[PDB]
Copies of this chain bind each other. A is one copy, B any other.
Amino acid sequence: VQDALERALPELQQALSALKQAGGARAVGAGLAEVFQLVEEAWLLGREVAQGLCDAIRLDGGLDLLLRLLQAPELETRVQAARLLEQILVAENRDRVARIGLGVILNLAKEREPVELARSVAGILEHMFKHSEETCQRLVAAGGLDAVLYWCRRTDPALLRHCALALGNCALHGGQAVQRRMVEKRAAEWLFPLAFSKEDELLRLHACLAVAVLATNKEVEREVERSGTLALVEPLVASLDPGRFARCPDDLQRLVPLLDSNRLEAQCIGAFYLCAEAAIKSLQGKTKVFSDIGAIQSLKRLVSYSTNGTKSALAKRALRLLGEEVPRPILPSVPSWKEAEVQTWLQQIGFSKYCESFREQQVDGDLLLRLTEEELQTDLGMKSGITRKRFFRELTELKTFANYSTCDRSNLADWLGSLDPRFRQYTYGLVSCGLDRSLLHRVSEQQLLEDCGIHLGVHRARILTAAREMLH
């Protein structure tokens, strides 16, 4: 508690006074080492104590004098002062470094032959990339990202870990321009060695997190998949165990898009990281942050429509750690569903209050896959257009992943998917209309709109043009 802080405060003052008073390089290094040991002692305890020491360093002006030591010519004091900095770049400090500290750390990153200094400045860049977007553009536009790549070229283990974390944090907090710059600067290729190497598991895990966060961007998927780095994500996630890493909030807001990525490797990485976080933080008293974020619903959607074993296992274990019971898998053959399957699907998608209404009207797979605005509005009681739009989004989710073999005859679902992944929702309407691959070249706009149910005009135009052109 704060009693340890009270004990460390005279130690903090003595260490800072010795560090500032020291004029010789070795004496400065000794004071910096005193501060380094004090900071590590607080970290080993716990988070509040280290944050308080970092606050005291800022109040004393010790971070500005630390920057002064960064501009110092002597190599040893630079190296070990940089170790102190990489230890103390807590969030309030990153602000002040964003203000004036930037532009000097870049100078450190320009020359990197000393291994320990290179490791320390790599960690410093890693920590600064998390702070804000303008910091990301300022660092990436300069030679910082080139420094990170060249450090990834080197074989130092801690340096490689730091560079993997740096690239990951830059990916999470960069934005469109920053990530496009990273892609153009060949980030995925240089992340490949970090993920592929068998020496360190955490290194590959962090590199896979970075490449998954890159793959979350639709435009980036070109270059990430052409790099080939994501191919190692799935075997890795299948291999390692979250529990031993557990033994070994805003970040969770960053991770949740990985669960809702729609990309396999990104979902695997997000499931693993969130399961590890759920374990370690459910070891703690409170578990509310996951519900605040919406992680439970995303994991339930992951389990319910899962096609792949590893994601299923990770999401199931993550939800099993929490108090909620595991969502139950759904049968892909929706046209063959019954009333109970509809009730289960409604309970899973969150529309539990409408289970009674669907049961009284006896909705089944045919009715569910041919439900319209009017039926929900009047028959089932979804008066709210927002609620109806939500139900339509989830119905499109169900229809996209469904088994239409019992109904389809000409493999029309694959054709619709080949035109567009989201076109597959219309397969049941098209087949119930009696249309097949051969019959599509006599279809008109009004027929689609009225009978098939393709409300959007753009989708109808694309479908008609593609049918008329390629089907002949």
List residues of A whose CB falls within 8 A of some B CB: 98-99, 132-135, 175-176, 179, 216-220, 253, 256-257, 260-261, 292-294, 307-309, 313, 331-333, 336, 338-340, 361-363, 366-367, 370, 374-375, 378-380, 384-387, 389-390, 393, 403-411, 420, 422, 433-435, 439, 442-444, 446-447, 450-451, 456-459, 461-462, 465
CB-defined contacts of A179 to chain B, threshold 8 Å: 405
From B366, B385, B406, B447, give the contact of A375 (CB < 8 A): B385
Contact between chains at A450 and B439 (CB < 8 Å): no
* A257→B406 contact, CB < 8 A: yes
Contact of A217 among B338, B406, B447 (CB under 8 A): B406
Structural contact, A407 and B218, CB atoms closer than 8 A: yes
- Residues from chain B with a CB closer than 8 A to the CB of A340 are 292-294
Q: Given A218-B409, A362-B390, are A457 and B461 also a contact pair (CB < 8 Å)?
A: no
Q: With A409-B219, A439-B462 given, is the CB distance from A374 to B385 under 8 Å? A: yes
Residue of chain B at shortest CB distance from A131: B309
**Residues of chain B lying within 8 A (CB to CB) of residue A370:** 389
The answer to whether B443 and A450 have CB atoms under 8 Å apart is no
Whether B219 lies near A405 (C-beta < 8 A) is yes
Measured in the bound complex, the distance between the Cα atoms of B410 and A374 in whole Å is 36
* A446 nearest CB across to chain B (Å): 7
**Complex contacts, A333 vs chain B, CB 8 Å:** 257
Are A362 and B374 neighbours in the complex by a CB distance under 8 Å?
Answer: no
Point out which of A220, A292, A309, A407 has the most chain B C-beta atoms below 10 A from its C-beta: A309
The one of B217, B294, B433 in contact with A456, judged by C-beta atoms closer than 8 angstroms, is: B433
Q: Nearest residue in B to A389 (C-beta to C-beta)? A: B367
User: CB within 8 A of A361: which of B216, B387, B403?
Assistant: B387
| Min CB–CB distance A467 → chain B (angstroms) | 13
The 9 A-B residue pairs whose C-beta atoms are closest, nearest first, are: A361-B386, A217-B405, A218-B409, A447-B457, A294-B338, A379-B384, A257-B336, A379-B386, A176-B405
Contact among B133, B175, B458 with A451 in the assembled complex (CB-CB below 8 Å): B458
Q: Within the assembled complex, what's the spacing in Å between the Cα atoms of A366 and B294?
A: 15
What's the nearest-Cβ distance from chain B to residue A455, in Å? 8
Q: How far is the CB of A307 from chain B (nearest CB, A)?
A: 7
> Which B residues lie within 8 Å of A409 (CB)?
218-219
Extra pairs beyond A218-B406, A378-B385 (4, CB < 8 Å): A132-B309, A176-B404, A434-B459, A442-B465
Chain B positions within 8 Å of A410 at CB level: 219
- In the complex the two chains form, what is the Cα distance from A444 to B465 in whole Å? 14
| Nearest CB in chain B to that of A298: its residue | B338
Residues of B within 8 A of A217 (CB): 405-406
Contact between B422 and A434, CB atoms less than 8 A apart: yes
User: Are B384 and A361 in contact (CB-based, < 8 A)?
Assistant: yes
By a CB distance below 8 angstroms, the chain B residues around A253 are 331
For A99, the chain B residues whose CB sits under 8 A away are: 309, 313
The answer to whether A411 and B447 touch (CB under 8 A), given A179-B405, A294-B339, is: no
CB neighbours of A407 from chain B (8 A):
218
Interface centre among A218, A260, A370, A456 (most CB of B within 10 A): A218
Q: Is the CB of A434 within 8 A of B458?
A: yes
Complex interface: chain B residues within 8 A of A175 (CB): 332, 403, 405
* Contact (A216, B446) CB under 8 Å given A385-B379, A389-B367: no
Partner of A450, one of B134, B339, B457: B457
15 CB < 8 A contacts A-B:
A133-B332, A134-B308, A175-B403, A218-B406, A219-B405, A219-B411, A256-B336, A257-B336, A361-B386, A362-B386, A375-B385, A433-B456, A442-B461, A447-B461, A451-B458
